Amino acid sequence: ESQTYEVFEKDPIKYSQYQQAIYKCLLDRVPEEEKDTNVQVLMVLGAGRGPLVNASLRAAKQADRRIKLYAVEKNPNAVVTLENWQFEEWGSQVTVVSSDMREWVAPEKADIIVSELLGSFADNELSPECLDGAQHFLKDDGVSIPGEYTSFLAPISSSKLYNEVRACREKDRDPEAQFEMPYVVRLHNFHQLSAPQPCFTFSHPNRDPMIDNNRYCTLEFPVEVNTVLHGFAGYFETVLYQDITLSIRPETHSPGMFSWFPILFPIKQPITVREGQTICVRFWRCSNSKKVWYEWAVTAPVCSAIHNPTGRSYTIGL
Amino acid sequence: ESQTYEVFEKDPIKYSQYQQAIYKCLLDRVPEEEKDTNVQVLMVLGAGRGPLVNASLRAAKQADRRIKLYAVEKNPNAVVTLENWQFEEWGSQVTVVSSDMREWVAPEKADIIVSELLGSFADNELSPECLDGAQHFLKDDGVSIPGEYTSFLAPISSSKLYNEVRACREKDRDPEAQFEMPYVVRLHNFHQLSAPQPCFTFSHPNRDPMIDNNRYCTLEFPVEVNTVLHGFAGYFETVLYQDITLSIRPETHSPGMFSWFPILFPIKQPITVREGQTICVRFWRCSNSKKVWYEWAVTAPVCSAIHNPTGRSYTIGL
Amino acid sequence: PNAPACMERQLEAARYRSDGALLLGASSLSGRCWAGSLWLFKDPCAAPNEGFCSAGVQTEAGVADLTWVGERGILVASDSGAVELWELDENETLIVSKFCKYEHDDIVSTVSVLSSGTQAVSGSKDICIKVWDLAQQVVLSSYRAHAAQVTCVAASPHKDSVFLSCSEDNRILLWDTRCPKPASQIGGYLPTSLAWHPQQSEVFVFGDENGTVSLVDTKSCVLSSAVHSQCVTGLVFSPHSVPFLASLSEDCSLAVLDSSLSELFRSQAHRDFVRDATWSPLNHSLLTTVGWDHQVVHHVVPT
Amino acid sequence: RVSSGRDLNCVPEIADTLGAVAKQGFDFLCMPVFHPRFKREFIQEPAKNRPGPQTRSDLLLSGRDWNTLIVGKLSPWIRPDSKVEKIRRNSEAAMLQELNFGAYLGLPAFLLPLNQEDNTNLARVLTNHIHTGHHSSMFWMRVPLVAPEDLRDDIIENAPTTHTEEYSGEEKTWMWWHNFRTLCDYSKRIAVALEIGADLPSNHVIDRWLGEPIKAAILPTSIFLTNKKGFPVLSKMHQRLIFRLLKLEVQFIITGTNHHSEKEFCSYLQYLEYLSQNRPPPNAYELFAKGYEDYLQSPLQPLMDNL
Ligand SMILES: O=C(NCc1ccc(F)cc1)[C@@H]1c2ccccc2C(=O)N1Cc1cc2ncccc2[nH]1
Ligand SMILES: O=C(NCc1ccc(F)cc1)[C@@H]1c2ccccc2C(=O)N1Cc1cc2ncccc2[nH]1
Ligand SMILES: CSC[C@H]1O[C@@H](n2cnc3c(N)ncnc32)[C@H](O)[C@@H]1O
Ligand SMILES: CSC[C@H]1O[C@@H](n2cnc3c(N)ncnc32)[C@H](O)[C@@H]1O
């Protein structure tokens, strides 16, 4: 909706980082002697109401380099905003494209592709799948911003949050579906039982043959207290370009930024953990031609059931 | 499964009709003077365990014409049967392809494409979508067998069948989902309230620009008795080639054939119908990029709710 | 040129007057502002460039339909519910608003000037048809005869009291204000456009939503042809003694037909909806079309 | 005292239009999301590939303004139940587009017309939209007391108006509503915007609408009489109806141009306010009960339970 884009745009720290990332990439790709010979082809993949396009314009102006912008966006309601802006402000420098990036037949290859397809668990919005399908119209030496992102997990104990998830039981579905799906939540009344560890990582452009976005990760969390595990807090970090990053991981959290809240993967049944014991969690990223989803299971100190098998309770639509 | 294909193959009337259809098409496409110059490229799209391939071989032998067979099949379990048969019996004349027909990049265009993708309501197995996506590798003057199929509907009164559907209520889903989905059923204890009328028709190859398989059909059924409408019996007819047809419509039913049982579209609530009144039903064929489904509603003599909106209760997977 | 800086994308109407000056109406049906404008082109070929215009003015709301009030006057069918009258000044450089009467309760979609030239008839989406006096600037009569939006109204060329009307209620009403019950219904698909025959007072043609162009005699038996694939927007006869009928549509094509509705010319010049046609009074073989693609195409019709 | 809105089908500048409407005392504005005349193609080339923006920007108002002050309107050219297959398919795509843009903006309500008997495909498209995504947006079905065909002037020579008392036939607009909401399976998101005509129907035709979810009452400017002072008023017939409607606590919408040109447009609203103040005040029952209207509660069981 409009007011969903509105609140995203209300985070100036994020777009200043995007501005700085693009600014740096333009200087690296275009030398001083080729300032006015070389026009860089930028493509905002998922332009929304156009915060990045604006940042791309600001970036080029502070760098003093020439750019040609495409603004690809599938949401036709947002494309209305883009085109009104484009007519009034931007002009012919920005070519608004109303299409899916995985479908769009590009009339030109890009030097840079810029995207904002990251959620609270990084790849929970299918950023890998989208940028893989947009990869073909990147130049062989082309750059992606972001170039990398990683998701993190940490075991938590919250009898409040467990009791909250429990209450999300609905008519006409599995009685325990609510435990087999992640939630975006500002975690407050909780206890982080161990330090976050990296779960899944993705690099763009992807150069590994048979680009497989399926994953399986085993994490061992040393717990130094007695407690009751109720779920797993999820965070993420992303490398926009080089040293320009965004992060919601508590220990490396970008200061001021409030666009992404933490994600929560619950478990059906609470699990006792003694001091000295290791919590061992297993996370899968799964997919077919239609859906992507996560499955997860605790294997130590006791086994849980595998949560969300075949995405029965939760899928992410392709 | 194996035993699902087994029971299909146990219908000799159907394949004799397919044999005769192909036999006739070969004679029409190849004259007597071009008997041994012209080899016709046949492509069985959805070969299963290979009843059509065999019929295509029999057809060519009784016609005395040369053919080159492809056997496209997506089910990899069936492809095991095909390849064992192909090695032992058929040989290099049959090229077994293990692929989706909508995906397969053909190394040659076909003179004839043969398919068996019809259900009890004709297009309930998405035969339109599959043959549309296989259309590109048909010659500009190429033939499809079947070339046409039509679905039929007829209002029925069965307090037995209504009570049967009712009992299909399951845990963890809509309490009335069972009424918003069709069923294959040998109709016995029922009363057909009016004569069947054509619902949806499809032609292959489709030559209408922007090939849209979505549909909306209004049918008016004159009822000459008092009764209680409980649903709509569905049948179908198909034109394989010219005068060679298959049909499960009671009045034009192919004698001996027992491959397809009738389909039943129930309604949530029974509807009173007085003698002289017209039952007016509305049928939609709907789709998105992932699913196809039917919606339906009675508008006379009283209105029902629209059944299966957005395919909430029933979808057919693409 | 003493006019607005930029005209709107969607060109709605184009009319030639006696001498051969091209009148243009246009609306913005997209973007921030949904207004309209009026333009004059003493040079028809200069259209639709705003830097080379004789006259131009910005109206309060969009322009749904217009037509020439002789030489000076221009009568407008506005979205506001007003029927606006503008008059060219003596120099014919400015366009001052004569009157603008908010009487319709919805968009005024069609307008036509009657034989006398002091009267006009308007049709609106409020399902009404109103008779105006351009002198006293008041509504003489108000008629709710239709049961749905009035699509097109067309005054009889030579009879002041007579006019046609068509609506989405699937009615073609032939009027005559001299009768107590003025409307008379002529006996599938909804009518969208009307055109009186210029040389025959009893003959008219109508285009429908399905694209069929029909030929109707008042007394009687009708003839028709499937000219367009989509709705017929307008029908305009040529100034010839033996007239040619120009048909425009939403299928983005123009067709010029003979007396028996056989296709003579075809033009797929436009990329958007073809909104109007006007035959050049100087050169009878020239025909100017305008569309929402912002083109002003001049067609050489083989005659 | 009374909650009122303004219906317009012409908005040249959305910011300016609101200001004028607000200055006249109106609480909200019913208006289009796309230009009413901006007909769009979705299948046939080249018109389907029409460039440029399809409508105004959402940025022209604040999120809060969209959420509280604007009521959407379906475009008049959109006819989902057309006999022509092309117009049907186009209107389907257009209806979804407009509804989706309504949701995008976060409009509290959206108007759709019931101006004919058959609105089956209209219902089918709306029901699909309701069961897609999440929204709390209401849908107000614009339905007249008296069908347009039944309040036309008897001025067609060879087509006289029905001078016969047709009890069932005069209730036809309720049957349009009834069928529509039955098809849509009594969605709580679907309500009535009842359009009041110049000539009110018989009493039974009005009583028909008792117990129906009437959220709005559309009052054309044409139905207003003029008093000796020269300001808009209503008949005693319409007065009793408004008094009945005020009990239901509906929102009154004014539509149409200013036929009382010499006066302001606030005068129409001032009259509704005048009526609002001049009603029988709530008794001890209605004062206390105010709040519990149609609120379901479990019957008390003082034996089984301890109160
Ligand atoms: O975490 C979130 N925002 C935190 C927040 C902060 C303040 C506030 F008042 C309300 C919410 C959003 C969000 C909000 C509501 C419901 C769900 C979510 C959600 O998945 N988010 C993550 C997110 C933000 C974002 N921006 C661009 C592109 C992809 C994006 N993915
Ligand atoms: O109607 C049906 N068969 C009737 C039948 C007869 C005898 C018997 F002992 C059991 C069943 C099958 C069927 C069986 C069971 C469950 C469902 C179905 C069903 O949708 N059918 C239709 C059908 C047959 C077929 N063949 C090839 C390709 C597509 C096809 N689609
Ligand atoms: C700013 S939130 C992400 C944005 O990217 C857009 N988006 C997501 N996936 C795609 C895609 N495959 N093609 C184009 N835009 C996309 C979404 O509609 C949203 O506006
Ligand atoms: C004989 S039943 C229909 C057969 O066609 C096959 N089939 C259905 N759709 C396709 C498709 N798109 N490509 C290939 N085979 C198909 C099914 O797997 C089955 O064996």
PDB file of C-alpha atoms in Angstrom, chain A residues 1-3 5-6 9 49 75 77-78 80-81 83-85 87, chain D residues 52-59 63 67 97 100-101 103-105:
ATOM      1  CA  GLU A   1       0.000   0.000   0.000  1.00  0.00           C
ATOM      2  CA  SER A   2       0.922   3.692  -0.233  1.00  0.00           C
ATOM      3  CA  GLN A   3       1.394   4.034   3.535  1.00  0.00           C
ATOM      4  CA  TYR A   5       6.043   2.699   1.129  1.00  0.00           C
ATOM      5  CA  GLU A   6       5.599   5.937   3.096  1.00  0.00           C
ATOM      6  CA  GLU A   9      10.853   6.307   2.915  1.00  0.00           C
ATOM      7  CA  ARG A  49       7.672   5.260  -5.046  1.00  0.00           C
ATOM      8  CA  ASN A  75       3.444  -2.981  -8.491  1.00  0.00           C
ATOM      9  CA  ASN A  77      -0.084   1.242  -8.073  1.00  0.00           C
ATOM     10  CA  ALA A  78       3.467   2.407  -7.298  1.00  0.00           C
ATOM     11  CA  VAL A  80       1.486   5.614 -10.923  1.00  0.00           C
ATOM     12  CA  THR A  81       3.611   7.520  -8.384  1.00  0.00           C
ATOM     13  CA  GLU A  83       5.332   8.252 -13.651  1.00  0.00           C
ATOM     14  CA  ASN A  84       3.799  11.358 -12.030  1.00  0.00           C
ATOM     15  CA  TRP A  85       7.183  12.094 -10.428  1.00  0.00           C
ATOM     16  CA  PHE A  87       6.841  13.686 -15.739  1.00  0.00           C
TER      17      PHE A  87
ATOM     18  CA  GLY D  52       2.231   8.032 -19.339  1.00  0.00           C
ATOM     19  CA  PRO D  53       0.693   7.873 -15.811  1.00  0.00           C
ATOM     20  CA  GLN D  54      -2.726   6.211 -15.544  1.00  0.00           C
ATOM     21  CA  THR D  55      -3.962   8.639 -12.863  1.00  0.00           C
ATOM     22  CA  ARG D  56      -3.010  11.176 -10.176  1.00  0.00           C
ATOM     23  CA  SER D  57      -0.260  10.588  -7.617  1.00  0.00           C
ATOM     24  CA  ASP D  58      -1.060   9.316  -4.117  1.00  0.00           C
ATOM     25  CA  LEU D  59       1.395  11.962  -2.863  1.00  0.00           C
ATOM     26  CA  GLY D  63      -2.029   9.235   4.105  1.00  0.00           C
ATOM     27  CA  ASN D  67      -7.854   7.324   5.028  1.00  0.00           C
ATOM     28  CA  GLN D  97      -7.287  -1.862 -11.192  1.00  0.00           C
ATOM     29  CA  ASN D 100      -6.647  -2.156  -6.100  1.00  0.00           C
ATOM     30  CA  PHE D 101      -5.726   1.542  -6.301  1.00  0.00           C
ATOM     31  CA  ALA D 103      -6.823  -0.283  -1.337  1.00  0.00           C
ATOM     32  CA  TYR D 104      -3.371   1.131  -2.132  1.00  0.00           C
ATOM     33  CA  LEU D 105      -4.536   4.603  -1.056  1.00  0.00           C
TER      34      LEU D 105
END
